[PDB]
């Protein structure tokens, strides 16, 4: 996240950290995710696209740090990895960028509710906040697009949603952004999501609830003027999520 503040998982207890194991002894961070129900985590397809071997990923819940433990954390295996059929990538955007991971603990269970582990809510059919709403994104992504490592402490920031009219202006992203995407920026382009934040949540309040409105997907650079962050519009995928969960 560029800008933002450092936080702990108590402030984002639905955030999931997804890592990949390597035949060598190392485990590396991949992308972030969110818990929808006790056994399901949601993220982005482009995070798995190149190595869709479920057996090699580990998911941790209740994690405030990247490579050190947090007490109360849970580790899971991906029992199912569902990527989107119709997932495309162009010279910038990713279309249908949503994925589902069913988790299983080494004891046969799914997530258990705690002060560091909670689920986040889904919107209702094509229901989103109005542009202007301030939402928060969270994650371990880069703190500057030129860095090459990720932070060790969880971060968070608040960004606002903008309209498609504004995001599809030629000097922004033109028609690379579609109605199944949402754009969010800082009025003064100071904070934004960045590489390493993909799959993670864009939460906003809707009808009283903290709802998962978007999933970090792409963006040109990080915190660049007139280059908003683009997210997957969760409210447009409800049918899809449903047919699988």
């Amino acid at each position: 996240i560029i800008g933002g503040e450092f936080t702990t998982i108590e402030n984002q207890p639905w955030f999931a950290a997804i890592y990949r194991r390597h035949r060598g002894g190392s485990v590396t961070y991949v992308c972030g995710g969110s818990l929808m129900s006790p056994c399901w985590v949601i993220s982005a397809t482009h995070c798995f696209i190149d190595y869709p071997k479920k057996e090699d990923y580990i998911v941790y819940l209740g994690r405030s740090r990247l490579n050190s433990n947090t007490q109360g954390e849970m580790k899971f295996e991906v029992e199912n990895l569902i990527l989107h059929k119709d997932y495309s990538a162009d010279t910038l955007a990713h279309h249908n960028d949503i994925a589902l991971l069913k988790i299983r603990s080494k004891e046969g269970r799914c997530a258990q509710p705690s002060r560091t582990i909670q689920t986040i809510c889904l919107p209702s059919m094509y229901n989103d906040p109005q542009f202007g709403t301030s939402c928060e994104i969270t994650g371990f992504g880069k703190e500057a697009s030129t860095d090459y490592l990720y932070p060790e402490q969880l971060k968070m920031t608040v960004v606002k949603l903008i309209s498609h009219r504004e995001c599809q202006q030629p000097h922004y992203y033109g028609s690379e952004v579609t109605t199944k995407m949402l754009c969010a920026a800082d009025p003064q382009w100071k904070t934004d999501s960045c590489q390493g934040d993909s799959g993670g949540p864009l939460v906003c309040s809707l009808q009283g609830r903290m709802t998962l409105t978007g999933i970090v997907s792409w963006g040109r650079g990080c915190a660049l003027k007139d280059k908003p962050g683009v997210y997957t519009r969760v409210s447009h995928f409800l049918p899809w999520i449903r047919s699988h969960t």
């Binding site: 108590e10 402030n11 984002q12 207890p13 639905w14 129900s37 006790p38 997530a111 509710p113 002060r115 909670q118 689920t119 986040i120 809510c121 609830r209 903290m210 709802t211």
Partner: peptide
């Protein structure tokens, strides 16, 4: 106790 989506404690 049980999950309550959206809640922080």
């Amino acid at each position: 106790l049980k999950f309550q989506c959206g809640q922080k404690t």
